[PDB]
Design a protein around this motif. Structure first.
Motif, PDB file in Angstrom:
ATOM      1  N   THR A 122       0.847  -1.211   0.000  1.00 14.85           N
ATOM      2  CA  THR A 122       0.000   0.000   0.000  1.00 14.85           C
ATOM      3  C   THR A 122       0.878   1.256   0.000  1.00 14.85           C
ATOM      4  O   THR A 122       2.036   1.189   0.446  1.00 14.85           O
ATOM      5  N   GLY A 181      -1.932   4.268   2.639  1.00  8.51           N
ATOM      6  CA  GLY A 181      -3.091   3.456   3.040  1.00  8.51           C
ATOM      7  C   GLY A 181      -3.996   3.122   1.870  1.00  8.51           C
ATOM      8  O   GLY A 181      -5.139   2.722   2.117  1.00  8.51           O
ATOM      9  N   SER A 182      -3.509   3.275   0.636  1.00 10.99           N
ATOM     10  CA  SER A 182      -4.249   2.909  -0.601  1.00 10.99           C
ATOM     11  C   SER A 182      -3.519   1.767  -1.323  1.00 10.99           C
ATOM     12  O   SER A 182      -2.265   1.769  -1.355  1.00 10.99           O
ATOM     13  N   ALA A 183      -4.292   0.847  -1.908  1.00  8.06           N
ATOM     14  CA  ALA A 183      -3.800  -0.316  -2.683  1.00  8.06           C
ATOM     15  C   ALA A 183      -3.886  -0.013  -4.182  1.00  8.06           C
ATOM     16  O   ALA A 183      -3.549  -0.895  -4.984  1.00  8.06           O
TER      17      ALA A 183
END
Ligand SMILES: *CC(=O)N(c1ccc(F)cc1)[C@@H]1C=CS(=O)(=O)C1
Ligand SMILES: *CC(=O)N(c1ccc(F)cc1)[C@@H]1C=CS(=O)(=O)C1
Lengths: 304, 304
Positions: free
Chosen positions: A280, A283-285
């Motif tokens: 990530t 906090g984003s994939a």
């Protein structure tokens, strides 16, 4: 530290939201000075929306057919006119909470806050971007039409969006505050399909700079590239072509981090070609594209 | 349609934010009635923060050492007291913009909006959750201390968070409005590590219901499970154990979609065991856990 999808504070816009009812249609309007702005489809039944003739529909409407309510106080309508796809309702009372404001027509890739409203009452605020296909990815239920999108520069609200339409694919279409639709969309319930939802390349790069600034550095690689080489990879992955204008705009973030724009492009290139491998970033994939370079500088430097 | 990370409208809280300066330390306070609430570390230099004795530091401070400014108007401080990790500064003027409010201490997994402020001036609003380890994942620069987290029920602001600390891992610690830290955190610049950041299982399930409601259905499978079987998979993936309380709380979303909670659990189980295979859900490439069941119902039904 920390980097979040941040909306502007909404108070200045909360104070402008009213309820507009024409016959049995209710939606939201924007009260600035002695004018209330609302979607012209306030004069339609859903039946009308299949092939409305707005000029003809409007002839059957008087000032007193436009019921305008600000909290629980009724505004007196003393005039009405159609400008493109919005109605301007002249009222006998200037909004005492009118902030300093502008109407601005934004470009695709530009971000703004949406104050979602129902019956003139704010429900919530979120950050959007005008997509390269002139849609926005909103959260809008029935009654949310006339909710507005805005930026704030210190004390001045720049209104850039009013909500009109949900496309059958659940994306959103609307106008600037002069009533001109973004993109080819129309206030008609018809076959309207969005084009390619391309990724806003300069916004992804800004966000990659934001990540480095906030400690997320694993995607930094040993490679560089050129605009032309990067752009071949951009094409393949439906990314907007990166221009020298975009490189120039990323200059301050480049300077602050000491990572050359083209090195960050090479980072992005590897991420596009290899994916995140289950890692990530902030906090984003996936690669976030709804922070402008201006948004990153603002949130990373604490502008108010 | 559309589902977005939505903050409450911030106007009611914008009207409560002031600047508090003690000596050469400036941060934000919350002005409700004739009291300004701010972090007690307003009395510290960064030097002090290594091992502060707040009662002793406080003895050197008078009412007139607390400079309180609301926009460009100074408030007269007529009293000060320490309650846990906050100062209450009594001022001679009730905030005329005081909304109906409560102080509530929230549980982990509960969501709230943060109005990020610098020098008493709002910069932006975003949605957070109290993490199972009693941290929040915020966006807070120097000067942001005393920024507050809140929920709004129609007209009543429930204040649940004031910002105090960034841990060396770039996550955030703070207090309720009685000055009690969430979790084991202290207002001291020391070795404080967050525990396991467990995923809020009931929030993921709520969000999966939200996705179905908004058209994203690819992850619905032919399987069911039991709380006990699901919970073995939860353990392995550092998910909070799902209780019958959580199942009960998901009942309305269950009812509205016609998908039994345990069937959605079986969906989640497969997603944990198999990952997304490069697909997305509500524009996310990972399982979102900062929407409560209450948030999903609110945003899906258009509450104001
Ligand atoms: C866009 C909107 O909010 N609504 C609407 C209004 C007029 C139309 F012709 C189509 C859609 C929504 C529908 C029913 S309402 O309660 O009048 C508002
Ligand atoms: C937490 C915060 O905003 N700041 C602070 C204040 C007092 C301390 F002891 C530590 C940190 C921040 C630091 C400098 S300031 O401008 O006074 C505010």
């Amino acid at each position: 530290s920390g980097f979040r999808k941040m909306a502007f504070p909404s108070g200045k816009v909360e104070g402008c939201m009213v309820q507009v009812t024409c016959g049995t249609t209710t939606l939201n309007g924007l009260w600035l000075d002695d004018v209330v702005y609302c979607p012209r489809h306030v004069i339609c039944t859903s039946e009308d929306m299949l092939n409305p003739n707005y000029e003809d529909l409007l002839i059957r409407k008087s000032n007193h057919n436009f019921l305008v309510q600000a909290g629980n106080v009724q505004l007196r309508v003393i005039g009405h006119s159609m400008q493109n796809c919005v109605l301007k309702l002249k009222v006998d009372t200037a909004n005492p909470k009118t902030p300093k404001y502008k109407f601005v027509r934004i470009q695709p890739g530009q971000t703004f806050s949406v104050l979602a409203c129902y019956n003139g009452s704010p429900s919530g605020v979120y950050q959007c971007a005008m997509r390269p296909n002139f849609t926005i990815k909103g959260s809008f239920l029935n009654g949310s039409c006339g909710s507005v999108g805005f930026n704030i520069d210190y004390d001045c609200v720049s209104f850039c969006y009013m909500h009109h339409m949900e496309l059958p694919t659940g994306v959103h279409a609307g106008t600037d505050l002069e009533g001109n639709f973004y993109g080819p969309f129309v206030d008609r319930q018809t076959a309207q399909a969005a084009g390619t939802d391309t990724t806003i390349t300069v916004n992804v790069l800004a966000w990659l700079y934001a990540a480095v600034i906030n400690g997320d550095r694993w995607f930094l690689n040993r490679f560089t590239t050129t605009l032309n080489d990067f752009n071949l990879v951009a094409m393949k992955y439906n990314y907007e072509p990166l221009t020298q204008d975009h490189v120039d705009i990323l200059g301050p973030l480049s300077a602050q981090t000491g990572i050359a724009v083209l090195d960050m492009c090479a980072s992005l290139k590897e991420l596009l070609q290899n994916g995140m491998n289950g890692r990530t970033i902030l906090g984003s994939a996936l690669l976030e594209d709804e922070f402008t370079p201006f948004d990153v500088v603002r949130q990373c430097s604490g502008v108010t």
